[PDB]
Amino acid sequence: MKTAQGGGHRTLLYGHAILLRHSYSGMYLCCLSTSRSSTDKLAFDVGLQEDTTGEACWWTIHPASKQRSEGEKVRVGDDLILVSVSSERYLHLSYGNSSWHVDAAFQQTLWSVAPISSGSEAAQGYLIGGDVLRLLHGHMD
Amino acid sequence: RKEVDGMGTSEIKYGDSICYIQHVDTGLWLTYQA
Amino acid sequence: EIQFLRTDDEVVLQCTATIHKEQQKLCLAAEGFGNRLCFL
Amino acid sequence: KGEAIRIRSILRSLGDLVGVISIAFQMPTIAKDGKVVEPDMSAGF
Amino acid sequence: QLRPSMMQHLLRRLVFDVPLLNEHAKMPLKLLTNHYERCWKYYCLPGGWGNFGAASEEELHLSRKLFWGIFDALS
Amino acid sequence: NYHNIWAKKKKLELESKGGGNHPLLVPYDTLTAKEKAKDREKAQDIFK
Amino acid sequence: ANVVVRLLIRRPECFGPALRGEGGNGLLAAMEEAIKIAEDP
């Protein structure tokens, strides 16, 4: 199966192959082997799937700015370029489809990162921002 | 307190606290009415 | 103060692009139960 | 394997290049000189 | 599929005496495509080329006998 | 014989025109599928 | 070959009218248009 050989909590350095997993859908963001996606080019389409085998499901982070270059602790608020899988594609914002549209195009596009919730503390009787909770009034009903 | 870029409060418990939710404009709002 | 991103973390994807003279910060969204392709 | 099927698929993507029979086996052959004259070297495939 | 003119078109292109030393890409192709083609589908051999080769004594097709005997074998 | 008659008529009209060419002077075994369909139709008509 | 093909596909060069929407390489109609304009001013 997996048989992972890593302790974990390793900080992601520029050039490391990364894996993304959806916190809700449970799947992994990948570059689909299909085409079209309302586009007319050699590009591919982005989507989600379950199997992690194969060269897919992996993304490599490359620094857009020359200030950081390769092999650095990627801090927050930086700019990253994702290019991997089977076409060296980029998470390009195709605005030609009457609106913004992400497709596996060959033109690089800026993509920032943000910390959404947390990565350190568990529940521990601490209401986190964004969760399903109850609203009991009389403590019984 | 406007900038929120980190928290270590753990002020409210999930099942060991009582909430008295107050709207910004009214003041109490939430209360049973039999 | 030094902050970075490791595994098991809180990554979320954002990008700003002025289209039709409007700057907006779009976020990548997807859901596997209803569709496959993603949408901003 | 290794950077070979990748480049092959990239070249094949440019579908359109899969079917180029209508260009390779196209028939603007043009006998040119034909019977006696008109040997157009400058213009023509 | 069918019986194309490959038995005679190649020879008609070969007998053009205008090119010189350009035939060297013709006889290996002919010798291999005669053996590759089945004898059942190879029906235009005598009247197509062998009668002309027999009528020719010392023509340009010096390897006509070998080309005919490639697929003859002994069975 | 029909193909020979048609080729002779084409050559005569080309000589009357004074200039031109046509690549249709092709032997039956060298003919392509487009004219092979017409040949098969003519053969079927002759058989019927 | 790797760097040549990568730099060729990272910046399209030709103007292919058959593709129209794409950058180029519209060989379906490009040679037809060329052979049509050959017998033209």
Chain G hits for D11, CB-CB cut-off 8 Å, are 5
Give yes or no for a contact between A88 and C19, defined as CB atoms under 8 angstroms apart. Answer: no
Give yes or no for a contact between A104 and A47, defined as CB atoms under 8 angstroms apart. Answer: no
User: Structure solved using which method?
Assistant: cryo-EM
Tell me what percent of chain E is helix, strand and coil, each rounded to the nearest 5.
50, 0, 50
| F18 at interface of D, judged by CB pairs closer than 8 A | no
Specify the DSSP class assigned to residue D10: H
Strand partners, A45: A32
Rounded to whole angstroms, how far apart are CA atoms G41 and G35?
Answer: 12
Burial of residue A91, with CB atoms counted within 10 A of its CB: 0-12 exposed, 13-18 middle, 19 or more buried: buried
Give yes or no for a contact between E58 and E64, defined as CB atoms under 8 angstroms apart. Answer: no
CB contact under 8 A, A106 and G19: no
Helix (H), strand (E) at residue A90: strand A90-93
C-alpha dihedral sign at A11, A13, A16, A22: positive
CB contact under 8 A, A10 and C9: no
Instruction: Give residue C35's Cα distance to chain centre.
Output: 18
| A77 at interface of C, judged by CB pairs closer than 8 A | no
Residue C15's closest CA among A109, D8, B26, A40? A109
Chain B hits for A118, CB-CB cut-off 8 Å, are 7
D touches which chains (3+ CB pairs under 8 A)? A, F, G
- Resolution of the coordinates, Å: 3.7
Give yes or no for a contact between G33 and G17, defined as CB atoms under 8 angstroms apart. Answer: yes
Burial of residue F46, with CB atoms counted within 10 A of its CB: 0-12 exposed, 13-18 middle, 19 or more buried: exposed
Q: Which structure tokens are listed for F31?
A: 């003919």
Q: DSSP per residue over C1-40, as a string?
A: ---B-BSS--EEEEEE---SS---EEE-B--TTT-SS-B-
| C23 at interface of A, judged by CB pairs closer than 8 A | no
Q: How many Å lie between the alpha carbon of F39 and the closest alpha carbon of chain E?
A: 14
